[PDB]
Design a protein around this ligand. Structure first.
Ligand SMILES: Fc1ccccc1-c1cc(NCc2ccncc2)n2nccc2n1
Length: 290
């Protein structure tokens, strides 16, 4: 750690403080994350090779005196701040589309290596002045787990959590990231979180109020999952035209596929990239005030 000068705290992450820092040597500006069982070290070490333009680069791992630090490529802003700033007029559809397209490429690459994110949210989707967006903290959930509360006791949000996780599936898949990204897509479009649950049941019931209570017809095997209760209320599914106006039919079609209940049938990142919604994708440059 003597090789880095902390510049400022840029966030309180799931696992510890996140700092902007400078490599006293090279002068490189990085993000430094404070987080060790050998299994966790091996998993993190493998992430050093999971390189892609839409994945925040893991530069190095420092483990000294039993304290662990991850060193990442630095990006200047997150999607949460950008959405808050763009709220009066909303993020233009071409930019939402470019961001969704890029995020799907990051997911497709990681998922091809069977690496999950598991905790996508606006706070870990990072943007630069060039119109790129990148996913931060990919693979960390498998290495360290996803706790109920962060190191600062902050509640880890449930808003983007896939229903199979909430229903107690032990061996959930890459589909959980597609669900989270669908929730984020809806939020960019409407300027409001889609499912802002404040407990596991409120999260689950919010999903059900919009998408309908799942049953054996739409999700074969759902009634067998650990946390499924036959006493869940039965809500009817809402039309997406009500849920995400004024998104066009291509976007609604893709969203509906990203929010399928049955994880085996939820669209993959690779298939989503081919959806007609991306026929006219471009790469606009966002207005960033840093
Ligand atoms: F991914 C994260 C989760 C939670 C907290 C921070 C992060 C977080 C935030 C950033 N940069 C964005 C930024 C820059 C300056 N001020 C604020 C944010 N960065 N940059 C690389 C990793 C990272 N992780």
């Amino acid at each position: 750690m003597e090789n880095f000068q902390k510049v400022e705290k840029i966030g309180e992450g799931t696992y510890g403080v996140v700092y902007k820092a400078r490599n006293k040597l090279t002068g490189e500006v990085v993000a430094l994350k404070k987080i060790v069982p050998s299994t966790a070290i091996r998993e993190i070490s493998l992430l050093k090779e999971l390189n892609h333009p839409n994945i925040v680069k893991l530069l190095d791992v420092i483990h000294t005196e039993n304290k662990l630090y991850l060193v990442f490529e630095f990006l200047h802003q997150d999607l949460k701040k950008f959405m808050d700033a763009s709220a009066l007029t909303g993020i233009p559809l071409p930019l939402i589309k470019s961001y969704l397209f890029q995020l799907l490429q990051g997911l497709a690459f990681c998922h091809s290596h069977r690496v999950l994110h598991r905790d996508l949210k606006p706070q870990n989707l990072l943007i630069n002045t060039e119109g790129a967006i990148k996913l931060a903290d990919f693979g960390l959930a498998r290495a360290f787990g996803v706790p109920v509360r962060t190191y600062t006791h902050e509640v880890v949000t449930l808003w983007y959590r896939a229903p199979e996780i909430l229903l107690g599936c032990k061996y959930y898949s890459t589909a959980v990231d597609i669900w989270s990204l669908g929730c984020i897509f809806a939020e960019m479009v409407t300027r409001r979180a889609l499912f802002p649950g404040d407990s596991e049941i409120d999260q689950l019931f919010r999903i059900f109020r919009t998408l309908g209570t799942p049953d054996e017809v739409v999700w074969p095997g759902v009634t067998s999952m650990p946390d499924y209760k036959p006493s869940f209320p039965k809500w009817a599914r809402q039309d997406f035209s009500k849920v995400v106006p004024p998104l066009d039919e291509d976007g609604r079609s893709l969203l509906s596929q990203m929010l399928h209940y049955d994880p085996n049938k939820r669209i993959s990142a690779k298939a989503a990239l081919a959806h007609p919604f991306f026929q006219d994708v471009t790469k606009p440059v966002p207005h960033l005030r840093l």
